[PDB]
Design a protein around this ligand. Sequence first.
Ligand SMILES: [Mg+2]
Length: 46
Amino acid sequence: MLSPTTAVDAAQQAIALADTLDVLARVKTEHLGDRSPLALARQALA
RNA sequence: GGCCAGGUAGCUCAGUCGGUAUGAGCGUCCGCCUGAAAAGCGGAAGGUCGGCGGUUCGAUCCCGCCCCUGG
Ligand SMILES: [Mg+2]
């Protein structure tokens, strides 16, 4: 599950839908950070 | 300045010579619970790993200089 990506599309779309600074902090948690599916792929680079 | 062990989450500190810090205890948030709490149980948030550069698709971890504590 590495080939394209759709994770960037869902991240930038949720970023574009953040209305307040509180939503963007959650969007940064869901689509970035440790538990995000984007970084879960970087973990699978082992 | 010399030589050195360090600087890692809000506090006090472990841990790692390339893709996860599974970080711990406590602090913060949610649920069950309570009139409202706390504990308990369950579920989460949060670190640019000292700064600035160097190498690599990728550096807290390797190279150089430097900031401050034990020296
Ligand atoms: Mg509670």
